[PDB]
């Protein structure tokens, strides 16, 4: 349990992502990371780090959450 790996974000995509391209998201909060972040999973399983504070990032989360 304590020796599990931790995934972190070292960069934030600077280009917004279409919601029709998103499949799911993860919340990164480990103090082991440089900072809290959001990881988007695209339709094709690609992972992308985004800034939790940007309006579109929050609007996406709200959408994926309200989704099925």
């Amino acid at each position, epitope marked *: *349990a304590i020796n599990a790996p931790v995934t972190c974000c070292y960069n934030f995509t600077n280009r917004k992502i279409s919601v029709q391209r998103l499949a799911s998201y993860r*919340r990164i*909060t480990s*103090s082991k990371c*440089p*900072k*809290e972040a959001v990881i988007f999973k695209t339709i094709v399983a690609k992972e992308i780090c985004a800034d*939790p*504070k940007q309006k579109w990032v929050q609007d996406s989360m709200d959408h994926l959450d309200k989704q099925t």
Partner: antibody
Framework: EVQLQQSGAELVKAGASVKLSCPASGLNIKDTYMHWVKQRPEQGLEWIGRIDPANGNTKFDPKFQGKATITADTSSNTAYLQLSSLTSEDTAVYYC??????????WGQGTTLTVSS | DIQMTQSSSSFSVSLGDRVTITCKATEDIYNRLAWYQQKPGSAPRLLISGATSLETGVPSRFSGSGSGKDYTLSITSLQTEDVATYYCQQFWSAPYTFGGGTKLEIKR
């Protein structure tokens, strides 16, 4: 690791104002949202507001507008909570916490505020 | 605002058995619920967020689940250190709000 320090205790006269401070270490408050939460034995936990130390924007629970002023300093990595024209209804325990998403994974030990004369 | 309420504000329990605390939201909150534990002299401690996500330093006997408007925290083989007050909190939309809390007491 992440750790938040708080003023600890405060004694202020009714009608006066007070400014509570919460210094952070182990993280940079720029990268997150700093919140303040009020707690009373009787009425429990209450979220007051948050501040984005990066741009200085705040969000408040209307119930605290004009009584609570949240401010921050990225240099000293400190968050502040100002309370104006205090009343006995204001005496309680005040916590500051981190939480870009809305829940709070890191808290300060809290600062007790007693409105007395 | 969204109002959070908990089944009861208190439960008398026994060391070792399973304990369940219930939370009910005023409206759907899409798993954006968090659970906290708080003992008499300190700040609340985050145990679970996202309704299911367990904070790292939290014992595996703690777990949560539910959806829409109904959520529950579950503690298996209750330990004495587990006796405290538990609060549910919603983070779907501001103003963020907590449940009134459920205090655990040991029966005798």
């Amino acid at each position: 690791e992440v750790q938040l320090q708080q003023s600890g205790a405060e004694l202020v006269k009714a009608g006066a104002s007070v400014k509570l401070s919460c210094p952070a270490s182990g993280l940079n408050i720029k990268d997150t949202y700093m919140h303040w939460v009020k707690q009373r034995p009787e009425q429990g936990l209450e979220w007051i507001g948050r501040i984005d130390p990066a741009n200085g924007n705040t969000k408040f629970d209307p119930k605290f507008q004009g009584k609570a002023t949240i401010t921050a300093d990225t240099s000293s990595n400190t968050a502040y909570l100002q309370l104006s024209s205090l009343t006995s209804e204001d005496t309680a325990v005040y916590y500051c916490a981190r939480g870009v998403f809305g829940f709070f994974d890191y808290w300060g030990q809290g600062t007790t505020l007693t409105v007395s004369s | 605002d969204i109002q959070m309420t908990q089944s009861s504000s208190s439960f008398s329990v026994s060391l070792g058995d399973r304990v369940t605390i219930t939370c009910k939201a005023t409206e759907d909150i899409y798993n954006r619920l968090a659970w906290y534990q708080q003992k008499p002299g300190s700040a609340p401690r985050l145990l679970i967020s996202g309704a299911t996500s367990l904070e790292t330093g939290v014992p595996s006997r703690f777990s949560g689940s539910g959806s829409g408007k109904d959520y529950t925290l579950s503690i298996t083989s209750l330990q004495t250190e587990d006796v405290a007050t538990y609060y549910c909190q919603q983070f779907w939309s501001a103003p963020y709000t907590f449940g009134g809390g459920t205090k655990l007491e040991i029966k005798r």
